[PDB]
Amino acid sequence: PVEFPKSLRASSHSSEGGTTKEEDIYGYELLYRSAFASYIAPTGAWNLVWFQAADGSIKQARWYGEWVISTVLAPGKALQGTPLTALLWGPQDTVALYYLSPQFELQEWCWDTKNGADNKYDGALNAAKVKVAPYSKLGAVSFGGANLAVYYQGTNNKLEEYTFGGGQGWKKGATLPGDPLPGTYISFVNRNKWDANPPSIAGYFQTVTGSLAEQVWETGGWRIGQFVIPAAPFLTPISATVSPEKDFPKIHVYWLSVESTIIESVNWHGWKAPKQIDNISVVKADISATSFTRDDGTVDVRIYGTAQLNVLFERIFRYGVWEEKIHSISVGKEIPIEVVGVAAA
């Protein structure tokens, strides 16, 4: 069997007090510690998840009644272990998938999805040849009205912005304030794309002291936000998603504890205390959260990432509760492996 810390739970069928003896799955055609990007329809009618297969290609899991796997980028397009971030924008409902080339340059893959047309093409960002820090993660937002911004880590480890729109094409944007941890995970969100207010953007990252910090863009520029987590695990995964709950924006920020359990912090008329959504240890690797508002004004959440041993999990927050059954989405060949909980010497 494989050994696992007996005080940790490896899956939803682990014993209440920790792992004793169980069976878990190794999906070995999923890149170990793959990056993930995700987008659920505003109605919740379909899901999109992107990940990296073991052979380096970028693949897509699409849910519409059931999950269907396809390949969007052939091997050689993306860095082995590339970060991934995605958005949907524009007149033709264009999916934009951002990744890194093997030469650590920003890349963009586009897919218009309006009226069932499958037009897929490289975005203009590729031509800008933006070199980033080799360990840079990626975030991205649209501000509506053909404006985009990609967020990344520059070679001096500052968070950097690249903007698109206003008839300009892609241009270097601001250098964001703060002191980001080299290789920090990042996640940027549009705080209120639903209302008719001025745009408000927020980003979340880890600083050189290990704390979690927040970028806020309002009324003309970036400044350090009020969200502060004094201590977090080294290079913890970070993912944020926003949807309106009861007609007010609800920010969800997710990262991992020292047990590699997912911690949630919610902002809805103020920040709530961080709380663990479940006590199951995931693989310490990229997670991706997405959300939508139901007709009754409550916000569903989906979180994707890597669960033991190496499977793509889906965590479901639906009607105010995290559901106890955690699905896995098969992306290739799998083997089951016996797992035993083992204590310290």
Place this chain on the structure above:
Amino acid sequence: PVEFPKSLRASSHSSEGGTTKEEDIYGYELLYRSAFASYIAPTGAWNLVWFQAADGSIKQARWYGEWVISTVLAPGKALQGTPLTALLWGPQDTVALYYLSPQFELQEWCWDTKNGADNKYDGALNAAKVKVAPYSKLGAVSFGGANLAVYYQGTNNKLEEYTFGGGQGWKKGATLPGDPLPGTYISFVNRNKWDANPPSIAGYFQTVTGSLAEQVWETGGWRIGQFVIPAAPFLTPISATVSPEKDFPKIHVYWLSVESTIIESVNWHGWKAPKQIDNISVVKADISATSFTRDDGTVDVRIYGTAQLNVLFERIFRYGVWEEKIHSISVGKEIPIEVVGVAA
């Protein structure tokens, strides 16, 4: 600060019962969870360590009185996160460093090191364009003064061999027995390297059940050896090294516990019980062990790998003791970070 499990020790200066409050180093120009290959001179006079930088280049740490860092392969040559394995062989003390291309093909970098000559070139193995499983690790041994063998995982997840020598060039070798874990770490060693033909070769790997197993080559074929660890962490790093102690081969096999502490099992007139060499948690990532025999017939060991938070450590087994101070070898810019032990 960054949070760390308080029941684990992150460094040699951690509290005896675990991490409380301490400062540790982040070397962010070392690829996070870099692969490592290593070689100490048979006399112990100098050391060679290879690793991958954050920018994807393959770099070299050379110790001769002090550590000196250089670049041996430019960015773009190696897969990001490539495995690494090395040997020294031949009349001209040639280093052969094996790695994967960005297209998951076996690659070889060569460096003659006899009489202070700096002759460096791509090896002929590159021309064979051997496609491997994308998560394959690498091992390699030389026997008989002019034979090489490279070990890797094929796309069907069997352990495979590619051979060089006998005036043949690089040829497909044996397919090894057993059911290797996909992406298993591997480490192959020559049991008695003084041109003993036929050779005796041993390899160590993790099976599809999570157990650790042993590959054995003797006249007549590869076979599954007697070394068995029934349970090990998923995709645990594995490294082996052999040197003669008191005129008999001493096999050292290293892997990680669930706490990411290094476990040692020695074969010297039979296998000894596995034992933890120290209780400091390393980063769960590739480790590389190398060894040499001293004048008094005892075997020194050096282990290289990633320590908290991201530094290249050197563990030293010298004159029968693992030394308490664990060095780190700086490979680029670093930042200090406060670390606090946390329970839940």
